[PDB]
Paper text:
After transcription, the 3′-end is oligo-uridylylated by a terminal uridylyltransferase, [name] (TUTase6)910, one of the members of the non-canonical nucleotidyltransferases. [name] is composed of N-terminal Zn-finger, RRM, palm, fingers and KA-1 domains. The C-terminal region of [name] is a previously unidentified RNA-binding domain, and it was named the KA-1 domain. Thus, the present structural and biochemical studies have demonstrated that [name] acts as a U6 [name]-specific terminal uridylyltransferase.
Therefore, the amino-terminal putative zinc finger (ZF) and RNA recognition motif (RRM) (amino-acid residues 1–140), the predicted disordered proline-rich region (PRR: amino-acid residues 235–304) and the carboxy-terminal region (amino-acid residues 651–750) neighbouring the nuclear localization signal (NLS) were removed. The truncated [name] ([name]_ΔN) was overexpressed in Escherichia coli, purified and crystallized. The form-I and -II crystals belong to the space groups P21212, and P21, respectively. The data sets were also collected from the apo form-I crystal, and the structure was refined to an R factor of 25.3% (Rfree of 29.7%), using reflections up to 2.8 Å resolution. The [name]_ΔN structure consists of three domains—catalytic palm (residues 172–403) and fingers (residues 141–171 and 404–598) domains, and an additional distinct domain linked to the C-terminus of the protein (residues 599–874). A comparison between the form-I and -III [name]_ΔN structures highlights the mobility of the KA-1 domain. The KA-1 domain rotates by ∼40° with respect to the catalytic core domains, using α14 as the axis of rotation.
Numbering used by the authors: 145 to 223, 329 to 637, 763 to 815, 826 to 877
């Protein structure tokens, strides 16, 4: 791993072969699945001891064929609003107590009622496994089955999802909190596959239409019905190879408009968000920077947790990866020893690249006034030489991001003792901070590019010439300085 993996990928054929080999290397072995099955069997035994006629259904990463080494083992146990909430929570604590106190080998048992779908986190010591026990999630089961079915429908699915998942983990695009879940990312890949000119994957509406006799199923008021096998469904006529589809993925999701679109896997289509239409239809949908609709429960946005910074970092990293995919280093293999193809994508992100990927949130303001205020801040308030979404090239011959404290203190003392410089204000900012900058003091020391997107309005700062490698300091400083600059500039109206 991380060593054997590198040489395994570098040695084999073309890019697609690298993706497939990656799938073969990351996927669970027969022993891991056997162990998981045994643990699930034990859980089943104890839960049957407590709940006669209860079924333990593994869901999530285990049964969806997207499994990787060390992945979570998620178990669904199958057996007045706040009374219902409290009852569900009580049942949850019941199951949690059964886990914590009865079944052999399990430790680390923590009840999580506060989550969207309440769950009991558990760890099993002897097998060295961990996961979530869900009381009610019946949807995760069906959509997991939908994922495995998606893998069975076309062979390129698993390579694309595995490669893009590893890449996302590498670019810091995936995880908990503000980041994208593996499920959300998977649904994004599948959506991409649905929207290709020849479709690679069918729309979920088409699957529901096909369905089958007795294959009809309804969960929580939603239609989960799809064909159980891929044999009753015609294959894809899309001939595009793995690498081409990867590059197309990067380019596509780089060029998409995420705020103005709710991506539907059911209709295999982009539904306009603005204004109000999908939020009026399903009534439960939370709209945000990135909107990706669950194929079954349509009131649920799987990406709804994603902040503007995370979506921005996503599209930036995708544009960069698309810029790499066009290069010869990607398409063609290497003679001896050099990194090619998938390797630069899976390799860890440079701090400069990691910081330049995630943009800087700016105060709300009209695009023109915002750009004007920005270039005014760089030009006037800083020593930046600037030149002409929007973008500008900026050059700094000075250390201006650092040393402002000492200089400001010196100016404070000098002005405290006697007459200083300035223009009389009730809190003006620009000119004063410009003086603070100018009191800190022809090849450019550090040169960088600033870029603002139309929606949402955010500044992306990427390096150009950085001989001394001081760019990240500048980036942090800008993260702090620019928002308050625009903030004080908004109060001049
Ligand atoms: Cl497209």
């Amino acid at each position: 791993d991380s060593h054997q993996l590198a040489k395994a990928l570098a040695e084999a054929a073309d890019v697609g072969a690298q993706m497939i080999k990656l799938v073969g290397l990351r996927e669970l072995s027969e022993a891991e699945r056997q162990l998981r099955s045994l643990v699930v069997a034990l859980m089943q035994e104890v839960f049957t001891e407590f709940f006669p006629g209860c079924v333990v259904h593994p869901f999530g990463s285990s049964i969806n064929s997207f499994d990787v080494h060390g992945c979570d083992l998620d178990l669904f146990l199958d057996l007045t609003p706040k009374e219902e909430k409290a009852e569900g929570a009580a049942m949850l604590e019941l199951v949690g107590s059964i886990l914590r106190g009865c079944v052999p080998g399990v430790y680390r048992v923590q009840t999580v009622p506060s989550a969207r779908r309440p769950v009991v986190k558990f760890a099993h010591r002897p097998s060295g496994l961990h996961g979530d026990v869900s009381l009610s999630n019946r949807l995760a089961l069906h959509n997991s089955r939908f994922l495995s079915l998606a893998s069975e429908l076309d062979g390129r699915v698993r390579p694309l999802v595995y490669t893009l998942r590893a890449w996302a983990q590498g670019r810091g695009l995936s995880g908990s909190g503000p980041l994208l879940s593996n499920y959300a990312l998977t649904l994004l890949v599948i959506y991409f596959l649905q929207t290709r000119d020849p479709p690679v994957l069918p729309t979920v509406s088409q699957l529901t239409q096909k369905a089958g006799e007795g294959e009809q199923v309804e969960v929580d008021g939603w239609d989960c019905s799809f064909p159980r096998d891929a044999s009753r469904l015609e294959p894809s006529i899309n001939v595009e190879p793995l690498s081409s589809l990867l590059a197309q993925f990067f380019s596509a999701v780089s060029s998409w408009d995420l705020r103005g679109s709710l991506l539907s896997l059911r209709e295999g289509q982009a539904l306009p968000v603005a204004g109000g239409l999908p939020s009026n239809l399903w009534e439960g949908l939370r709209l945000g920077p990135l909107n990706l609709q669950d194929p079954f429960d349509l009131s649920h946005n799987v990406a709804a947790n994603v902040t503007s910074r995370v979506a921005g970092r996503l599209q930036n990293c995708c544009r960069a990866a698309a810029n790499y995919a066009r290069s010869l280093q990607y398409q063609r293999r290497s003679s001896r020893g050099r990194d090619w193809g998938l390797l630069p994508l899976l390799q860890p992100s440079s701090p400069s690249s990691l910081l330049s990927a995630t943009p800087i949130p700016l105060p709300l303001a009209p695009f023109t006034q915002l750009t004007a205020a920005l270039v005014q801040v760089f030009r006037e308030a800083l020593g930046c030489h600037i030149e002409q979404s929007a973008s500008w090239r900026c050059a700094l011959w000075h250390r201006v991001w650092q040393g402002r404290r000492r200089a400001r203190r010196r100016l404070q003392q000098q002005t405290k003792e006697g007459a200083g410089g300035g223009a009389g204000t009730r809190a003006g900012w620009l000119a004063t901070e410009a003086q603070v900058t100018q009191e800190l003091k022809t090849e450019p020391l550090l040169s960088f590019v600033a870029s603002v997107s139309p929606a949402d309005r955010m500044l992306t700062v990427t390096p150009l010439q950085d001989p001394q490698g001081l760019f990240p300091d500048l980036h942090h400083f800008l993260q702090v300085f620019l928002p308050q600059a625009i903030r004080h500039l908004k109060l001049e109206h």
